[PDB]
Design a protein around this ligand. Structure first.
Ligand code: HEM
Length: 291
């Protein structure tokens, strides 16, 4: 199936900047969530999980249809906790009922990255809600207890190469693992609601110990109180990934640029943009607007 981007009728950049802004203002206001981490990280994860169901082989899943709103997908065990991001977005959707669900989930992630001082992420509108029976089955999102070969093979299905995978994984600077959600516990670093290249620096520079958590799963832990999943640690066990980790640990701008591209790509898999579609939008942050 072909999913053609269809601009919400009559809307243009200013309409979407208003949605951006409402998201950004609520991010600022609702600051208590998750022991004052705020909603930034879970909104980034929501954007990724709503996009990451995509299968390049048949164009099933992906961000276009906004299918997370249906119970099979919002109840995927892999999505445990993302209901917090959905509930955050609910008043946004009520204020702007014209935006599609896929456009809102993906825009939430863009807005979160940018408001957390991350790179600009160009964003295109035009996702169209699709019916309940187009919801992908559970099991398309990745396991965390696996090795580099797993990660590499997994991400081929999303048409991501080694550099794109290592870049995307840098989002694990953000937020934390929660035991009751994923069976893993702990943050990956100190700056977990500011978008930086800290994930790579911590992988290379902390002294990691392979421990079992209270859910009896193995994870890598440091004396600073940080953790890495087995799939995170695989990025320094595999020599191809390791080279790229070192690159991003040593060049914040390069990480920003490569993340931006990869994240936009992730959010746009499966969508066909007509030749006369609008160019991608680059939203101004609240700070840049003086708001
Ligand atoms: C091999 C791939 C990946 C695996 C196995 C993985 C696994 C996980 C797990 C287990 C959690 C903790 C969930 C919890 O307990 O709350 C998590 C959190 C998170 N992941 Fe991933 N992840 C992967 C890729 C990505 C990518 C590609 C992004 C986005 C670009 C991403 C963004 C996030 C964010 C932002 C959080 C924190 C959520 C929060 O604090 O609520 N992850 N991931």
């Amino acid at each position: 199936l072909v999913h053609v981007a269809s601009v919400e009728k009559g809307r243009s950049y200013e309409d979407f900047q208003k949605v951006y802004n409402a998201i950004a203002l609520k991010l600022r206001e609702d600051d208590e969530y998750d022991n004052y981490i705020g909603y930034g990280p879970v909104l980034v994860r929501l954007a990724w999980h709503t996009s990451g169901t995509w299968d390049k082989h048949d164009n099933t899943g992906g961000s276009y249809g906004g299918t997370y709103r249906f119970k099979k997908e919002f109840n995927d065990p892999s999505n445990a906790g993302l209901q917090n991001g959905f509930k955050f977005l609910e008043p946004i959707h009520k204020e702007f009922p014209w935006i599609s669900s896929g456009d809102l989930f993906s825009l939430g992630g863009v807005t979160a990255v940018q408001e957390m001082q991350g790179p600009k992420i160009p964003w295109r509108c035009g996702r169209v809600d699709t019916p309940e029976d187009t919801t992908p089955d559970n099991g398309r999102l990745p396991d965390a207890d696996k090795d580099a070969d797993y990660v590499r093979t997994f991400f081929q299905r999303l048409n991501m190469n080694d550099r794109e995978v290592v870049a995307l994984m840098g989002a694990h600077a953000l937020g934390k693992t929660h035991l009751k959600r994923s069976g893993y516990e702990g943050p990956w670093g100190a700056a977990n609601n500011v978008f930086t290249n800290e994930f790579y620096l911590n992988l290379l520079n902390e002294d990691w110990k392979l421990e079992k958590n209270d859910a009896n799963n193995e994870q890598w832990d440091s004396k600073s109180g940080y953790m890495m999943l087995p799939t995170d640690y695989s990025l320094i066990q595999d020599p191809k990934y390791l080279s790229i980790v070192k690159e991003y640990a040593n060049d914040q701008d390069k990480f920003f640029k490569d993340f931006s591209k990869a994240f936009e790509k992730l959010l746009e898999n499966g969508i066909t943009f007509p030749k006369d579609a609008p160019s991608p939008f680059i939203f101004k942050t609240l700070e840049e607007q003086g708001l």
